[PDB]
Amino acid sequence: KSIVITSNTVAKSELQKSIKFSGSIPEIYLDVVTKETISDKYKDWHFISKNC
């Protein structure tokens, strides 16, 4: 019955999938990014969306 962790699991997962980065991407970064809920610091206009 219990299958998700709050709403972060889907958000963290689908941020992780579309990440366009070849490195580590620690889960702490995904957790702090996907758990803002107060300010829109991490959501902004991105004209460049692919690796240069």
Partner 1 sequence: QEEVIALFEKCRNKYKEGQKKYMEIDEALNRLHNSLKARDQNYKNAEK
* Footprint on this chain of partner 1 (rule: CB under 8 A): 1-2, 6, 37-38
- Least separation in angstroms between residue 29's CB and partner 1 is 18
Q: How many CB atoms sit inside 10 A of residue 11's CB?
A: 15
- Least separation in angstroms between residue 2's CB and partner 1 is 7
Q: How far is the CA of 19 from the CAs of 3, 38, 44, 52, in angstroms?
A: 24, 23, 15, 14
> Which CB, 39 or 51, lies closer to partner 1?
39
> Which CB, 25 or 42, lies closer to partner 1?
42
